[PDB]
Design a binder for this molecule. Sequence first.
Ligand SMILES: Nc1ncnc2c1ncn2[C@@H]1O[C@H](COP(=O)(O)OP(=O)(O)NP(=O)(O)O)[C@@H](O)[C@H]1O
Ligand SMILES: Nc1ncnc2c1ncn2[C@@H]1O[C@H](COP(=O)(O)OP(=O)(O)NP(=O)(O)O)[C@@H](O)[C@H]1O
Ligand SMILES: N[C@@H](Cc1cn(C=O)c2ccccc12)C(=O)O
Ligand SMILES: N[C@@H](Cc1cn(C=O)c2ccccc12)C(=O)O
Ligand SMILES: [Mg+2]
Ligand SMILES: [Mg+2]
Ligand SMILES: [Mg+2]
Ligand SMILES: [Mg+2]
Lengths: 258, 258
Amino acid sequence: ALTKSQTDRLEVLLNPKDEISLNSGKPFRELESELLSRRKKDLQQIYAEERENYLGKLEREITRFFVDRGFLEIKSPILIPLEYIERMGIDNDTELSKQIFRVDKNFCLRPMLAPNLYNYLRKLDRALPDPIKIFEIGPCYRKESDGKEHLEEFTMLGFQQMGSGCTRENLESIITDFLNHLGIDFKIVGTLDVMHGDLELSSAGVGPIPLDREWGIDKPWIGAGFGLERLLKVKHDFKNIKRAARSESYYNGISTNL
Amino acid sequence: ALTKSQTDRLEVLLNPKDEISLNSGKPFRELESELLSRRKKDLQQIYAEERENYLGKLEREITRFFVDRGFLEIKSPILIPLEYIERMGIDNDTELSKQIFRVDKNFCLRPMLAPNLYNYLRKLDRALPDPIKIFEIGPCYRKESDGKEHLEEFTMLGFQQMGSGCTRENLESIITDFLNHLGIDFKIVGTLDVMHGDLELSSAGVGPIPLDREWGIDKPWIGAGFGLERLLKVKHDFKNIKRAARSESYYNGISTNL
Ligand SMILES: Nc1ncnc2c1ncn2[C@@H]1O[C@H](COP(=O)(O)OP(=O)(O)NP(=O)(O)O)[C@@H](O)[C@H]1O
Ligand SMILES: Nc1ncnc2c1ncn2[C@@H]1O[C@H](COP(=O)(O)OP(=O)(O)NP(=O)(O)O)[C@@H](O)[C@H]1O
Ligand SMILES: N[C@@H](Cc1cn(C=O)c2ccccc12)C(=O)O
Ligand SMILES: N[C@@H](Cc1cn(C=O)c2ccccc12)C(=O)O
Ligand SMILES: [Mg+2]
Ligand SMILES: [Mg+2]
Ligand SMILES: [Mg+2]
Ligand SMILES: [Mg+2]
């Protein structure tokens, strides 16, 4: 009988496509040696043929989708003014107030993309024709309890359209085309949330809302934010989101501790 | 005569390809109105045709270069253990000790890519055939004095090969092909540095060095690190590197304050 520590070890080495039973009557050393061989071959095959990291490759695929659909690609600061969090209505009653990674006295690691995209919408509205469509993909940071669905360092897609065409029907069409393009099953529930069973893939929004006026926004809008590691978790059927993260412990969901 | 404040304003709006003289006898309001019109058209043309951000597009171009040349694409944590900095030999005598953005008691924003790539080289050497070639592109953070060549939030390309073929001649060939592919003028000076006039584009290295053994490395290696915003600064002839940064003030080097 395998110890719980031994099965922990084997579970690190197990990939979802594997058809191996850790409850069979094979000794630990030989189950471990066979999984080690499979995971080394998996890495050798990535190295010989494609060589692309899942997170980078997904970011490039989402980028092509949104650029093709008319959205401008934004790359804005990750280290943001702390004032942005308060100005988002995030006071001490919200959970998010307590999840902020603070840096120095005035800055933080952004936990969200809405403040930076608000600022781009306001500025670009003086120069671009209606509607204004933008999107960004990049790191976001939140303090979290340990959890199979949560990372403290994760990657967010955020997109927003402002001006004409900002209907709920148009917002659902973008989400629906987007996730059918990626091959990810979903349900939209309605403020709107895109779910994969009990896992939240996205929260989406329809403006105007009162908060817009703090950001100098006074036009209707639609938008949403998606976690890239959650999309990878669903797509590759990982049991824990850490398999999809920026990590020294996993490469494309394969253990690097061999 | 324009005030220094007025010429500051016009300099924000000026792009390097512009052929306008701020020392001519045209009033401020009319120089400003003409530059505003040119910069709005520049953004409208990006929005109508390509829609890609310079920094994202460069990162994708460098990625294709290195993947094609056999390097594995790494995406590793940006928030790293503080112990990594000391273990890199960065004590209080070095300047880099004082440039670290600390987070919580045990973590920091990575100022460099060498620690994470060391760890990947050690782990991947148990699984991949010789030589091992890897690369990463992503955010790095250093506290800096104000400067036309320095950002506190910047983007680093780091690549490293370990095992056979780790000669200085092979390292110079990678650098030379890489920068001729991007269309950036350079000189290699020799520890080796890749310069564009007085601006450092890259520092490169040839192992083994004594430090390798703290990281469990005992094979020869070659590698280098390049700042992406410095490559953009040179390529687009920006007078200040802030035009190339993750920014709310500039989009593809065009002022967003119109
Ligand atoms: N810690 C995290 N790790 C991974 N993805 C995350 C994390 N926090 C948020 N996301 C993703 O970012 C999206 C937009 O953020 P947001 O709606 O604010 O998340 P949220 O409400 O805190 N979701 P949740 O914490 O699961 O209840 C979410 O739908 C997730 O897909
Ligand atoms: N603050 C910064 N802003 C932009 N690029 C940077 C910055 N610091 C380093 N880089 C880039 O990263 C490369 C590798 O880092 P490194 O050799 O450690 O820089 P460095 O020695 O501090 N260069 P410098 O500060 O200009 O004398 C450099 O060659 C630069 O191209
Ligand atoms: N609120 C999260 C995710 C998010 C929801 N949105 C629905 O409107 C967004 C619009 C733009 C950018 C992000 C989001 C965040 O701010 O990142
Ligand atoms: N020392 C800087 C840049 C750098 C120089 N290198 C020369 O060997 C590297 C090799 C791999 C990764 C980065 C670098 C840094 O650590 O990021
Ligand atoms: Mg949450
Ligand atoms: Mg939500
Ligand atoms: Mg320096
Ligand atoms: Mg240097």
